RNA sequence: UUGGCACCUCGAUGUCGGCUCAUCGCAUCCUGGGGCUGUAGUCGGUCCCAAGGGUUGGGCUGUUCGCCCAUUAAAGCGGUACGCGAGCUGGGUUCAGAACGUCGUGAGACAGUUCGGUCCCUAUCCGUCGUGGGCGUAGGAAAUUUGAGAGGAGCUGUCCUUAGUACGAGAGGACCGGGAUGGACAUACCUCUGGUGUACCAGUUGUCGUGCCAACGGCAUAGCUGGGUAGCUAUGUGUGGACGGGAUAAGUGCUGAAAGCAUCUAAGCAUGAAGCCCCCCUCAAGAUGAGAUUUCCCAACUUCGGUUAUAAGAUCCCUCAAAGAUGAUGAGGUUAAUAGGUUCGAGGUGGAAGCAUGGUGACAUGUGGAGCUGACGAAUACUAAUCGAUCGAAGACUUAAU
């Protein structure tokens, strides 16, 4: 099976109407203040819960 | 264990008047026929080839050669049918499941007594 | 004609009075509490809404349904209640003989009242024509390339589209299923159990719901 | 659990020896027969002299099988090998005698000469 | 239990590695469902190892990897004796949960949630 | 159906039969309701209403057909590109090889036969089966819901009793009514019987290792073999098509005139099918006509239109499973038993290792229902569900009544 119709500019963007990527969930490091991954070690400063890893 | 309201509903269910035995073991079992408003006591001899389940489930199998055929009855442990069971005899076996009986015959399919 | 809400425990089995096996599930159907009463004139009809299983109290902070949140705090408190983990309707009882605020006890049924019970079947995910819908494999040799498809969708120019209801794959079971004219056992109110002869929709812990049954 | 095509001893001195199953009766599509249960055959095979030749289609009760059956007291009997008995139209067998254990349902099913010939009744 | 991508054999294998090189390091970096799997594997073995007697040594031989611990002091010891040593002694008054595992974040080859699992 | 015609398609509309999946018509095969009968009864014949459901396995042949065996209540007839090859097959038929009969001088040929003979395609659109996000439903939310609609289901045997009665010389043998139990089908489910059960237990071969013994590990389909937990499962266990109501069909009548009689029909009143509408099961307010009930939240600042972050609530992220392609759903997130670990069990396996004893030994016995054990039950914060962040109201106008 192939594509009876081209497919117009419209219909593709309609369909990558979902296509995207999301914000990382991130919050700010209790430690250093800098952004980090929730529920990941910090890599700026290398804190988790208030302890060095 | 099992679940406990399981446990707790089935408790009076089970029998406390079983003798102990093991697959291998020769059992008579007194069996309660109650056919019409007549009942008697048949009596069924043979090898325990096999105890599975727990509690109220629990079930065992008796086999016996009549007249040349194999005979195999399966009873819940349980089942007020059964007046009495007899062990007869301890069988010494080396598993808990005794199919391979089922193919032999003769003194092919004799078991040790203990 | 009464209803009550209990979890599935798990099938075994009881010995009848002449010594016959009877499968039997077991249900756990305590804390089942009148929550509301709907009337024809409020409402439109007649039901008593029942609440089944506690929860835990709102607190502040809550993350999990565990905990009851304000306005289910607020619809319980007004019966008088714990915040409860379920909540069903039942149409067929008679409004009058309950009170909001009462407990519903495992003792209002009794052993060999028939009954219907409706649950959630178990989830499938995903399936095939084969398993969701019964149908015939292909063969599965002489050069067979159908085994398992669902087989022709439609006919020809006439009429040039599959008609709705063509059975296909897709998401199989959790539905809403009832059986009707199942019988109560036995009731044991120490452990607020009911034995319901045979087996009924759903997993283990599912929600179900007895009711007298319809049929009659 | 007999069906078409299906081998079984005959248990009885009717002349038959093995029969192959021809049809299950007792309603259409109805896909397998077991103990208590009539079906017809052809005789494969027959011992020379016997009222029943090779070849006869006739009918049978089937007697022993491997599945077995199941009871309402949720016992099971089950044999080693499946056998039928030769009947006539009124349930009475051709021969004259029955080898061989027999389960119960027979009774049930009114075969009540055949359980009686029966040397055990299970 | 999970399967890793892996027949039963490799798994098995894997599984086998993973918990040695555990034993040694005491903390190693791996991705985040080898490590859930692994947890179990080296607790179990730690068990063993608590338990001191002579079956419990040979089971854990059955898990363990033949491996050379070279100590600080040119002392050597296999990974089976350090865990029925330091380990065990270690964990004497814990009851379970010898291990943790600390997320890391995706790596950049094929974004895998790399993590660390450590003994304590 | 066999044709006639040559209007679409020769910059291709794949052609017989079978398989899978159906769907529709009724001119009805069975089951339901009737009229007439050269209908005694049991059976039948013929016609009318009726499309709800049902309407079998095999032998032969490529076959469709057809015949035959054995059933069944019955083994319906047709349409859907003689339904369905981007779903399957490829036996026939319609390529190239070879051969027989036959025809032809021959090359060759034959709705004559024979043996052999490549079936491609990652789904863009509609369509269909599932499953999410957005906005709307004049505040923001959590639950429970009505049911406009829609879908499902809808079949039938045998036996017992009435009653060996009615009927019939006899043979035979009922209607109506009351019970029991099946076939096929559907659905849920794993207590039972079984299947599977690649991180459960055990036996065992060859070979290579852990230095050796002993005990173990790797590889040989999971090396092989005997068992087997949860889950998933049928052939296994339960349940269903029950009982009814309303209006009707063909009919059957009552009263009744037109038309002094007669007449079921004109007015009027009854009765009457598995069929229609309900009753039963499921979905369902995007039912834009967006419905209903209960509960929760409710202030400051304003260029005084309006805004704001917050509230109730819900998410991100994390531990997970009864849920699952992914979303989603559900159980949990320290004020915590969500998972792992740990401890105790269930079920499974079947007697660990070490030691001792008896044997020359292979082995056996004791210690000891031992040891081990994924998923199942219970307990326990030891590990991890940290610290955090984001979204989310202030309720338009008109009229009437109060
Ligand atoms: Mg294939
Ligand atoms: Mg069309
Ligand atoms: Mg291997
Ligand atoms: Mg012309
Ligand atoms: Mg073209
Ligand atoms: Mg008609
Ligand atoms: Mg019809
Ligand atoms: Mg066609
Ligand atoms: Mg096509
Ligand atoms: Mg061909
Ligand atoms: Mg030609
Ligand atoms: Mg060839
Ligand atoms: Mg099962
Ligand atoms: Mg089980
Ligand atoms: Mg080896
Ligand atoms: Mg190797
Ligand atoms: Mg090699
Ligand atoms: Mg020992
Ligand atoms: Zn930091």
Do not use: W
Not at chain 2, 73 to 82: A, D, G, M, N
Not at chain 3, 19 to 36: D, R, S, Y
Not at chain 5, 18 to 42: H, P, Q
């Amino acid at each position: 099976a192939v594509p009876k119709r081209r497919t117009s500019k419209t219909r593709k963007n309609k369909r990558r109407t979902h296509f995207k990527i999301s914000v990382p969930g991130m919050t700010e490091c209790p430690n250093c203040g800098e952004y980090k991954l929730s529920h990941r070690v910090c890599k700026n400063c290398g804190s988790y819960n208030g302890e060095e890893v | 264990t099992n679940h406990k309201l399981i446990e707790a509903v089935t408790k009076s269910q089970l029998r406390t008047d079983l003798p102990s035995f093991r697959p291998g073991d020769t059992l008579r079992v007194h069996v309660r026929i109650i056919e019409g408003t007549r009942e008697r006591i048949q009596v069924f001899e043979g090898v325990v080839i096999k105890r599975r389940g727990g509690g109220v489930s629990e079930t065992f199998t008796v086999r016996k050669i009549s007249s040349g055929v194999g005979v195999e009855r399966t009873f819940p442990l349980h089942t007020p049918k059964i007046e009495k069971i007899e062990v007869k005899r301890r069988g010494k076996v080396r598993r808990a499941k005794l199919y391979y009986l089922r193919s032999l015959r003769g003194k092919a399919a004799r078991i040790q007594e203990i | 004609t009464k209803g009550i809400l209990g979890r599935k425990i798990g099938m075994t089995q009881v010995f009848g009075e002449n010594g016959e096996l009877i499968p039997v599930t077991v249900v756990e159907a305590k804390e089942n509490v009148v929550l509301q009463k709907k009337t024809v004139e409020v409402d439109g009809y007649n039901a008593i809404q029942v609440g089944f299983e506690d929860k835990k109290a709102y607190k502040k902070d809550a993350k999990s349904n565990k905990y009851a949140n304000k306005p289910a705090e607020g619809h319980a408190k007004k019966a008088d209640a714990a915040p409860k983990r379920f909540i069903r309707e039942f149409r067929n009882v008679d409004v009058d003989a309950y009170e909001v605020g009462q407990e519903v006890s495992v003792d209002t049924f009794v052993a060999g009242d028939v009954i219907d019970v409706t649950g959630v079947s178990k989830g499938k995910g995903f399936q095939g024509a084969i398993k969701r819908h019964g149908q015939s494999r292909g063969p599965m040799s002489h050069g067979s390339h159908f085994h398992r498809a669902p087989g022709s969708v439609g006919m020809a120019s006439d009429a040039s589209r599959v008609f709705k209801g063509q059975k296909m794959p897709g998401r199989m079971g959790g539905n809403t299923v009832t059986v009707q004219n199942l019988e109560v056992v036995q009731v044991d109110t120490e452990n607020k159990v009911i034995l319901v002869k045979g087996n009924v929709p759903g997993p283990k812990k599912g929600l179900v719901e007895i009711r007298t049954s319809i049929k009659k | 659990m007999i069906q078409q095509e299906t081998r079984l001893k005959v248990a009885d001195n009717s002349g038959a020896r093995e029969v192959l199953t021809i049809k299950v009766l007792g309603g259409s599509g109805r896909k397998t027969a077991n103990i208590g249960d009539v079906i017809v055959c052809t005789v494969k095979n027959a011992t020379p002299g016997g009222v029943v030749k090779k070849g006869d289609v006739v009918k049978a009760v089937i007697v022993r099988t491997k599945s077995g059956v199941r009871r309402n007291d949720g016992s099971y009997i089950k044999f080693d090998e499946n056998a039928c008995v030769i009947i006539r139209d009124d349930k009475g067998p051709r021969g004259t005698r029955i080898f061989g254990p027999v389960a119960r349902e027979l009774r049930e099913g009114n075969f009540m000469k055949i359980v009686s010939l029966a040397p055990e009744v299970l | 239990y999970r399967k890793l991508g892996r027949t039963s054999d490799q798994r098995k294998a894997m599984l086998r590695d993973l918990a040695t090189s555990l034993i040694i390091s005491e903390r190693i970096e791996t991705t985040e469902a080898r490590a859930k799997e692994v947890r179990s594997v080296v607790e179990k073995l730690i068990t063993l190892g608590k338990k001191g007697d002579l079956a419990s040594r040979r089971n854990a031989a059955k898990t363990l990897r033949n491996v050379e611990i070279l100590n600080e002091d040119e002392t050597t010891q296999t990974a089976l004796q350090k865990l029925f040593g330091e380990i065990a002694e270690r964990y004497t008054e814990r009851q379970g949960g010898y291990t943790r595992i600390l997320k890391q974040g995706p790596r950049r080859g094929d974004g895998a949630e790399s993590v660390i699992i450590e003994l304590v």
